[PDB]
Structures are given as structure tokens and as C-alpha cells.
Design an enzyme around this catalytic site. Sequence first.
Site, PDB file in Angstrom:
ATOM      1  N   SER A   1       0.850  -1.157  -0.178  1.00 20.17           N
ATOM      2  CA  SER A   1      -0.088   0.184  -0.071  1.00 20.17           C
ATOM      3  C   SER A   1       0.959   1.245   0.057  1.00 20.17           C
ATOM      4  CB  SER A   1      -0.906   0.014   1.224  1.00 20.17           C
ATOM      5  OG  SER A   1      -2.155  -0.867   0.929  1.00 20.17           O
TER       6      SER A   1
ATOM      7  N   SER B   1       1.415  -3.243   3.763  1.00 19.94           N
ATOM      8  CA  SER B   1       1.413  -4.591   4.350  1.00 19.94           C
ATOM      9  C   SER B   1       1.052  -5.631   3.212  1.00 19.94           C
ATOM     10  CB  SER B   1       0.631  -4.916   5.773  1.00 19.94           C
ATOM     11  OG  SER B   1      -0.506  -4.746   5.352  1.00 19.94           O
TER      12      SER B   1
ATOM     13  N   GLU C   1      -5.455  -3.447  -7.068  1.00 24.00           N
ATOM     14  CA  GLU C   1      -5.601  -4.320  -5.907  1.00 24.00           C
ATOM     15  C   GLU C   1      -6.685  -5.153  -6.014  1.00 24.00           C
ATOM     16  OE1 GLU C   1      -4.152  -3.657  -3.100  1.00 24.00           O
ATOM     17  OE2 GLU C   1      -3.592  -1.470  -3.032  1.00 24.00           O
TER      18      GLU C   1
ATOM     19  N   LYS D   1       0.162   3.828  -2.881  1.00 26.42           N
ATOM     20  CA  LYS D   1      -1.043   4.675  -2.850  1.00 26.42           C
ATOM     21  C   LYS D   1      -0.504   6.123  -2.811  1.00 26.42           C
ATOM     22  CE  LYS D   1      -4.052   0.902  -0.988  1.00 26.42           C
ATOM     23  NZ  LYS D   1      -4.634   0.172   0.304  1.00 26.42           N
TER      24      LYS D   1
ATOM     25  N   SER E   1      -6.213   3.405   3.989  1.00 25.97           N
ATOM     26  CA  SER E   1      -5.545   2.389   3.018  1.00 25.97           C
ATOM     27  C   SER E   1      -6.617   1.726   2.247  1.00 25.97           C
ATOM     28  CB  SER E   1      -4.594   1.140   3.717  1.00 25.97           C
ATOM     29  OG  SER E   1      -3.542   0.911   3.238  1.00 25.97           O
TER      30      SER E   1
END
Length: 260
Positions: A43, A210, A139, A46, A103
Amino acid sequence: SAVQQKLAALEKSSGGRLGVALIDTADNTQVLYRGDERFPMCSTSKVMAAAAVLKQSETQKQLLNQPVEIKPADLVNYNPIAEKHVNGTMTLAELSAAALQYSDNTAMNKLIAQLGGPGGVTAFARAIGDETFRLDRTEPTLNTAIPGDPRDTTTPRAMAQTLRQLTLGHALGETQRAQLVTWLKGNTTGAASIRAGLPTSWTVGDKTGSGDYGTTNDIAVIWPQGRAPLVLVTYFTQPQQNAESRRDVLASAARIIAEG
């Protein structure tokens, strides 16, 4: 150096692979540990997607207020904010905030779509001088973190230099840069990572990440009291596909750096 000896000892105790890059903006000095090895971003990617949309808003002045529809088919594996707006809309500003501060994976996929696919996020990295960052997937599959796989990776050195540009430099316009800083400072997921290893009086803006293989990441801009800001990247991954996250390792690496 003393710090590098302590980071190597931390790494040895952890059983994983640790990558660290610090930039001290007071004298542009750098401290690196596995600084040129690739790590899965998870992440932390992002930040680049949000920054890319901010860059588009410098020409499209109203872009951040544009409504985007959240449909049930948009939802993926972790959508804490997007879930609250299914069959409604969120603006690109609200999606950027959700991606960064919670997230939210659906928010990330909407940002990627706005940029024309993962290639559009990578394009923005190239445009600001980052030749290392690569975003290949959406994702949630960008988090597979398979050892040796170059997809969706960067290096600590590259990410530290790019995060510096985005937040303290002038890769973005002034309003856009201030908005990005405000978003990072308001992150809700970072209390046990880099922030946990730093004096409680320092202001931190960070983005965690993560993924599989126990991958545990955090990238941060740090404003010490009466001292020039720092940029600190900490990446960590492990040999077991089912390994648990190790946010304590990131906290300990920050503590070792702060001792400098």
C-alpha cells in the site's frame, strides 16, 4: 557506520530482509541499508497514485470535486471507507483521502482507473524523475510480494527521494503539495510503525503498507521540533508466505535512526 551495524543486527534478529533510506534535509545527507534492493511496495504505492491525481488537478482545477460512483462490483478485499458509500458517490478528493489515511483498496483502484491503468501511475513516477518505481497490477493482487518478483516494487533509495520531492520539494504545485502533506499527517494506520520509534513531540506524516510474505512497510516525512525535516523509508519482508506482520521492526529501525 554505527547505525548500519545496528540495523544489520536488527535485521539478523528479525529473520527477514530490511531496507531503510533516510534523507536528512539539513545537509542532504543519506543513510542507506539495502538502499538499492527491490522490495514489494504494497500500500505504500498509494502515495504515487494520489500524487498523480493531484498533478492532474493543476490543469483540471475542479478535478478533485468530481463525483465517482461506488458500485458493489468495485469493492475488493479491504474497503473501510468505500463500503460506507456503495450505490452512492465519492469525490476524487474523498477517494484520495480514503486511499491514504485508511488504506482503502477500492479507493486505490478508482485512482488507478482515473490515471488510465497502472501504466498511468508508473508514467507519473517517470515524469518526476523516478526510474525505479513500477506499478504493474491493481488491488488486491499487487500485494502478493513474491520473492524475486519485480512487479509492484521500488527501492528504499528511490522512494525516499521521490517522497521528498512530492512533500518537501516542488514536483507538485503549492496547493497540491500542501494537500498531500495534510493527508499524510492525518494517516490513521501508522501508530505502531515508524511513529512508535520516534519522540512523541515530532510531527509525522506516513503511509503504511502490508502484504503477503509478512511484508510490513512504512514511508514517512518527519518534522522534528526546531530542526530540518527528515524523510524515512522502511521496508521489510520475510521468507514465509504466511508470516505475520512485524510493525515492531519498523519502529525499532526508526528508533535506531533517531539515535543519530
